[PDB]
Amino acid sequence: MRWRDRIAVLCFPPGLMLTVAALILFFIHMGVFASDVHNFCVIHNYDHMSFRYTVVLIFSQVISIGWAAMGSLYAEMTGDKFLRCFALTILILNGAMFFNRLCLEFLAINYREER
Amino acid sequence: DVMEKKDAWDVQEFITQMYIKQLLRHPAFQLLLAFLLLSNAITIALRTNSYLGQKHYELFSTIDDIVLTILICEVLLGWLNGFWIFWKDGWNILNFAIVFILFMGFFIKQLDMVAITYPLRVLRLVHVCMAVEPLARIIKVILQSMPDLANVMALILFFMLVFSVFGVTLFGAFVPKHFQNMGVALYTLFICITQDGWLDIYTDFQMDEREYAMEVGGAIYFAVFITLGAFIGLNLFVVVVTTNLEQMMK
Amino acid sequence: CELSEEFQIYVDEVPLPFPGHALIAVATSVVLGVLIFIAFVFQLRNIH
Amino acid sequence: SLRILKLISYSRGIRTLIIAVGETVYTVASVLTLLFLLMFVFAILGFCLFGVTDR
Amino acid sequence: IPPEDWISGVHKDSQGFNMIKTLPINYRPPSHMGISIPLTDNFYHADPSKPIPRNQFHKSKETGKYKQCANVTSRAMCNCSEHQKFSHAVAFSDCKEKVHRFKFPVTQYPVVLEIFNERDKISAEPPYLVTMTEVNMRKNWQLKHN
Ligand SMILES: CC(C)CCC[C@@H](C)[C@H]1CC[C@H]2[C@@H]3CC=C4C[C@@H](O)CC[C@]4(C)[C@H]3CC[C@]12C
Ligand SMILES: *[C@@H]1O[C@H](CO)[C@@H](O)[C@H](O)[C@H]1NC(C)=O
Ligand SMILES: *[C@@H]1O[C@H](CO)[C@@H](O)[C@H](O)[C@H]1NC(C)=O
Ligand SMILES: *[C@@H]1O[C@H](CO)[C@@H](O)[C@H](O)[C@H]1NC(C)=O
């Protein structure tokens, strides 16, 4: 249809947008991961490293993972290989980045606080 | 019918059909959940012993987290089909309350202790085990029978009050400490209604005037009242049981 | 005169702080999620 | 006593009574499991109410 | 703990737990911002001949004062004695090596104090009120008292 009008309004076509949201979640979480690694390696400024927001961005991680999955499932029935490849690539990169941040946080454990 | 091309709502109903196809009809996922719950039940049975818990406390915490996260995942998946149907259900309210109390005591600080953490887990154990069929009929008829139990309980308690007036006329400050305090008196009368080992009480009011006194009167009144009430209660219990069970047999 | 004393205590085997528990819980949760979802995609794609 | 049980393995009337009462095995097993679950629930409750305090 | 196994330092409490631990060389107690970064400026097992452990980050390197084991070359050069091998006090801690050990949650550790009075040994009295301090700036301990 008028993608034009599709992108017009009232709302929007099926899912899609919900898939590209995982992309911009990937963008911001990659930026935060880069800042974490940068502050861990050279500058050594543990005062302003993300030791403080710990569980809330992990919850953001998991809702983004579920969102990318649900978008892939809700976009697979279009019958076109490109959309499926798009969604599956986003799922794979989000899962890899989640596991990477989990390994990073489990590694830097002696640096936050003690209970 | 022919259904040349599906629409959005057919797609949604089909997606929900695959969603209820797994974890609700597949025996494998329920079997895995039951296996995990039986394993943590075994670890519960491995408690009451610090000699085992010294090498097991960290593993106990980890398996607590695992069972909590799979419980909340199940609750979220149930909420996916709709919040209204999960809120308007006869039994899902209980699982929701169980996981809500457990997670509230877990993440937020709480005085709930093991006396909340473990009974809630075994309540979930029961709620999982009744879903597997060969005790579901018996639990169903137990919950069908309890509303008919309620009237028998109410009548029994009302009769025991209207006879406890006659009791408390000869109670308090004499043959005391079990006939006094007017609620300890009521519960001692209930103890005698349960009809076991009241010879301690029989020796308690013994030797009033060593032959008859009120040692005859109060004892015989209370004894015939006890035997009549005990027979009536036990009968009414078994007859309500069989009455509500005949509803099962139909 | 000032009566004072000092002593030393070493403790060990901390099980885990909070992020370790959080990480193992969410890791198992998402492992189950991706396993169930891989099964879902495999079935629904192989029907087509 | 197991040999005595093998003695009582005869008497076909007892066999017919056993047949007539043998379909209740599943029912008594289910009620036994319910008893065991309730016993476990109040076991952990009683331990946490009176055994944990250690007074 | 007997002195011979205090020297040996391999004691076990009949259950698999080491009752005595030799502290790492150039050890400092942890701080609030993390258990791998020292900010306590008090050195245990102080030895200048060896490189410094756990000492990244600027404020860690800007602290740590060698009091007894000074710029005299090393631990064998910084001579100590037996009374510096049992003094649980501060400023004698440069040659503190062997300490005790405990499980993770200690519970009801008895802090019992006794006083010598030239004739006998008595216990601390209710007139003798007492204050507590930790000399490494930590905040995860508490006392039960009546
Ligand atoms: C709200 C939804 C969309 C998730 C997005 C999370 C955003 C809002 C969060 C997650 C990562 C966060 C940042 C992570 C790191 C830094 C640097 C730190 O020294 C102070 C906090 C600060 C500056 C945070 C600000 C807020 C932030 C950008
Ligand atoms: C060497 O040790 C002495 C002893 O206190 C001290 O005064 C002096 O400053 C030290 N010199 C250096 C270079 O550390
Ligand atoms: C012992 O140590 C002191 C300072 O701590 C030093 O002056 C003295 O020379 C040392 N003695 C020996 C024999 O090393
Ligand atoms: C301290 O511990 C001792 C030994 O167990 C005990 O008798 C005492 O009651 C405890 N005191 C407090 C205040 O807990």
From Swiss-Prot, chain A:
The chain crosses the membrane at residues 17-38, 52-72, 85-107. One of its GO terms (cellular component) is motile cilium. It is a multi-pass membrane protein. It is found in: Cell projection, Cilium, Flagellum membrane. Keywords: Cell membrane, Cell projection, Cilium, Flagellum, Membrane, Transmembrane, Transmembrane helix. Residues 1-16, 73-84 are cytoplasmic. Residues 39-51, 108-115 are extracellular. PANTHER family: CATION CHANNEL SPERM-ASSOCIATED AUXILIARY SUBUNIT TMEM262 (PTHR37998:SF1), TRANSMEMBRANE PROTEIN 262 (PTHR37998). Auxiliary component of the CatSper complex, a complex involved in sperm cell hyperactivation. Component of the CatSper complex or CatSpermasome composed of the core pore-forming members CATSPER1, CATSPER2, CATSPER3 and CATSPER4 as well as auxiliary members CATSPERB, CATSPERG, CATSPERD, CATSPERE, CATSPERZ, C2CD6/CATSPERT, SLCO6C1, TMEM249, TMEM262 and EFCAB9. HSPA1 may be an additional auxiliary complex member. The core complex members CATSPER1, CATSPER2, CATSPER3 and CATSPER4 form a heterotetrameric channel. This is Cation channel sperm-associated auxiliary subunit TMEM262. It comes from Mus musculus (Mouse).
From Swiss-Prot, chain B:
Component of the CatSper complex or CatSpermasome composed of the core pore-forming members CATSPER1, CATSPER2, CATSPER3 and CATSPER4 as well as auxiliary members CATSPERB, CATSPERG2, CATSPERD, CATSPERE, CATSPERZ, C2CD6/CATSPERT, SLCO6C1, TMEM249, TMEM262 and EFCAB9. HSPA1 may be an additional auxiliary complex member. The core complex members CATSPER1, CATSPER2, CATSPER3 and CATSPER4 form a heterotetrameric channel. GO terms for molecular function: calcium-activated cation channel activity; voltage-gated calcium channel activity. Keywords: Calcium, Calcium channel, Calcium transport, Cell membrane, Cell projection, Cilium, Developmental protein, Differentiation, Flagellum, Ion channel, Ion transport, Membrane, Spermatogenesis, Transmembrane, Transmembrane helix, Transport, Voltage-gated channel. Testis-specific. It is a multi-pass membrane protein. Pore-forming subunit of the CatSper complex, a sperm-specific voltage-gated calcium channel that plays a central role in sperm cell hyperactivation. Controls calcium entry to mediate the hyperactivated motility, a step needed for sperm motility which is essential late in the preparation of sperm for fertilization. It is found in: Cell projection, Cilium, Flagellum membrane. The chain holds residues 42 to 291 of 442 of the full protein. Belongs to the cation channel sperm-associated (TC 1.A.1.19) family. The keyword Transmembrane helix applies. The keyword Nuclease does not apply.
UniProtKB/Swiss-Prot annotation, chain C:
Testis-specific. Specifically present in the principal piece of sperm tail (at protein level). Specifically expressed in the seminiferous tubules but not in the interstitial cells. Within the tubules, it is expressed in spermatocytes and spermatids, but not in spermatogonia. It is found in: Cell projection, Cilium, Flagellum membrane. It comes from the Eukaryota. Auxiliary component of the CatSper complex, a complex involved in sperm cell hyperactivation. Sperm cell hyperactivation is needed for sperm motility which is essential late in the preparation of sperm for fertilization. Component of the CatSper complex or CatSpermasome composed of the core pore-forming members CATSPER1, CATSPER2, CATSPER3 and CATSPER4 as well as auxiliary members CATSPERB, CATSPERG2, CATSPERD, CATSPERE, CATSPERZ, C2CD6/CATSPERT, SLCO6C1, TMEM249, TMEM262 and EFCAB9. HSPA1 may be an additional auxiliary complex member. The core complex members CATSPER1, CATSPER2, CATSPER3 and CATSPER4 form a heterotetrameric channel. CatSperb is absent in sperm from mice lacking CatSper1, suggesting that stable expression of CatSperb protein requires CatSper1. This is Cation channel sperm-associated auxiliary subunit beta. It comes from Mus musculus (Mouse).
UniProtKB/Swiss-Prot annotation, chain D:
Testis-specific. It is found in: Cell projection, Cilium, Flagellum membrane. Residues 12-19 are cytoplasmic. Disruption phenotype: Mice are normal but males are sterile. Male sterility is due to defects in sperm motility unability to fertilize intact eggs. The chain crosses the membrane at residues 1-11, 20-46. Belongs to the cation channel sperm-associated (TC 1.A.1.19) family. Component of the CatSper complex or CatSpermasome composed of the core pore-forming members CATSPER1, CATSPER2, CATSPER3 and CATSPER4 as well as auxiliary members CATSPERB, CATSPERG2, CATSPERD, CATSPERE, CATSPERZ, C2CD6/CATSPERT, SLCO6C1, TMEM249, TMEM262 and EFCAB9. HSPA1 may be an additional auxiliary complex member. The core complex members CATSPER1, CATSPER2, CATSPER3 and CATSPER4 form a heterotetrameric channel. Pore-forming subunit of the CatSper complex, a sperm-specific voltage-gated calcium channel that plays a central role in sperm cell hyperactivation. Controls calcium entry to mediate the hyperactivated motility, a step needed for sperm motility which is essential late in the preparation of sperm for fertilization. This is Cation channel sperm-associated protein 3. The chain holds residues 150 to 204 of 395 of the full protein.
